[PDB]
Design an enzyme around this catalytic site. Structure first.
Site, PDB file in Angstrom:
ATOM      1  N   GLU A 108     -35.845 -33.610 -32.676  1.00 30.57           N
ATOM      2  CA  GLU A 108     -35.253 -34.095 -33.952  1.00 30.57           C
ATOM      3  C   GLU A 108     -34.639 -35.381 -33.981  1.00 30.57           C
ATOM      4  OE1 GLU A 108     -34.656 -32.317 -36.660  1.00 30.57           O
ATOM      5  OE2 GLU A 108     -36.093 -30.795 -35.899  1.00 30.57           O
ATOM      6  N   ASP A 149     -28.014 -48.018 -32.861  1.00 28.07           N
ATOM      7  CA  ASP A 149     -28.031 -46.484 -32.566  1.00 28.07           C
ATOM      8  C   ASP A 149     -28.418 -45.965 -31.168  1.00 28.07           C
ATOM      9  OD1 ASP A 149     -26.980 -43.679 -32.840  1.00 28.07           O
ATOM     10  OD2 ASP A 149     -28.663 -43.155 -33.852  1.00 28.07           O
ATOM     11  N   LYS A 153     -28.819 -44.446 -27.618  1.00 30.83           N
ATOM     12  CA  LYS A 153     -28.464 -43.257 -27.024  1.00 30.83           C
ATOM     13  C   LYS A 153     -29.315 -42.627 -26.155  1.00 30.83           C
ATOM     14  CE  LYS A 153     -29.593 -41.093 -31.481  1.00 30.83           C
ATOM     15  NZ  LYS A 153     -28.989 -40.543 -32.721  1.00 30.83           N
ATOM     16  N   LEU A 199     -44.217 -41.843 -24.758  1.00 30.32           N
ATOM     17  CA  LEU A 199     -43.593 -41.940 -23.290  1.00 30.32           C
ATOM     18  C   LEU A 199     -43.305 -40.489 -22.989  1.00 30.32           C
ATOM     19  CD1 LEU A 199     -42.848 -44.884 -24.365  1.00 30.32           C
ATOM     20  CD2 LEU A 199     -41.843 -45.074 -21.961  1.00 30.32           C
TER      21      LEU A 199
END
Ligand SMILES: C=CCNc1nc(N)c(C(=O)c2ccc(Cl)s2)s1
Length: 294
Positions: A12, A123, A125, A79
């Site tokens: 997601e 963003d 993360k 990747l």
């Protein structure tokens, strides 16, 4: 999509589902992202398209922007594993320090590159940091937030993570700077070292207060102008800063020093990616190969 063959649903994404697909005319495997709807901003396609131009060993290449059938798709180089999964897989033993250092060094190079090209991520993360068997780590989704607009929640009603959000954003500042990325990377650096998220907030105020409980409630002394930020409240509890040695044990003084510079409250005082690359923590940096189970 037809020009592709959906091998699987990787996961997601922040803007939509991500798929592992195969280009029908070339046989290449890529990371296909479907961008969640009233026509698709022409400003966005132009902005995003300029990103196909960015090229760096530490940036996941945006191969193409495909606008067909009034649907938007971003094609990225594939990747094999993300840092979230690698950290979970390394939970019992922890990521070796030399590899943690190599990863941080490379990420800073990718940041330094994007920032010099006037591109912010906003963003960062563990989920969008990708690694390969060769020891490289790359940042994906750079420049998307600015081109689009960080939505409160995805169409999947899946929870967005606030763990890596810079304090200035949490306090409602509507102007971003390169410093927001340094903050996120500092949080990730700490998480790789301790094997636990640094500031795992479950809400915007919980996220803010967790930062305050560890680094102390900011004031005009350490962050000139903070009391005038949009969501600042004079009623915020006043927490004393905690000894920094308790924050990321057992990282050494060079590492703790660098981390504290990446986590300064005032965006302006926060170390740049370029300056961070010159920090003494990287004097003995090398490029180890990770043990990846694919
Ligand atoms: C299991 C191997 C998956 N390979 C991937 N390759 C890429 N390039 C991925 C992404 O760009 C993202 C996916 C989610 C975010 Cl958030 S960024 S995932």
């Amino acid at each position: 999509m037809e020009n592709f063959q959906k091998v699987e649903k990787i996961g997601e994404g922040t803007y939509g589902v991500v798929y592992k697909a195969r280009n029908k005319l070339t046989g290449e495997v890529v990371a296909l992202k479907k961008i969640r709807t009233e026509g698709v901003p022409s400003t966005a396609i132009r902005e995003i398209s300029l990103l196909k131009e960015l090229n760096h060993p530490n940036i996941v290449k945006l191969l193409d922007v495909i606008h067909t059938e009034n649907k938007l798709y971003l094609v990225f180089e594939f990747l094999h594993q993300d840092l979230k999964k690698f950290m979970d897989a390394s939970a019992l033993t922890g990521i070796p320090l030399p590899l943690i250092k190599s990863y941080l060094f490379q990420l800073l190079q990718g940041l330094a590159f994007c920032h010099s090209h006037r591109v912010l991520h906003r963003d960062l993360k563990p989920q969008n940091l990708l690694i390969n068997t060769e020891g490289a780590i790359k940042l994906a989704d750079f420049g998307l937030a600015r081109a689009f607009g960080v939505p409160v929640r995805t169409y999947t009603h899946e929870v967005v993570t606030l763990w890596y959000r810079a304090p200035e954003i949490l306090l409602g500042c509507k102007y971003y700077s390169t410093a927001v990325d340094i903050w996120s990377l500092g949080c990730i650096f700490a998480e790789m070292v301790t094997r636990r998220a640094l500031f795992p907030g479950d809400s915007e105020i919980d996220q803010l207060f967790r930062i305050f409980r560890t680094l102390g409630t900011p004031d005009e002394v350490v962050w000139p102008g903070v009391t005038s930020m949009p969501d600042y409240k004079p009623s915020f509890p006043k927490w004393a800063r905690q000894d920094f040695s308790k924050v990321v044990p057992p990282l050494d003084e060079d590492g703790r020093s660098l981390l504290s510079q990446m986590l300064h409250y005032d965006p302006n005082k926060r170390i740049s990616a370029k300056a961070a690359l010159a920090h003494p923590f990287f004097q003995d940096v090398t490029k180890p190969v990770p043990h990846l189970r694919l």
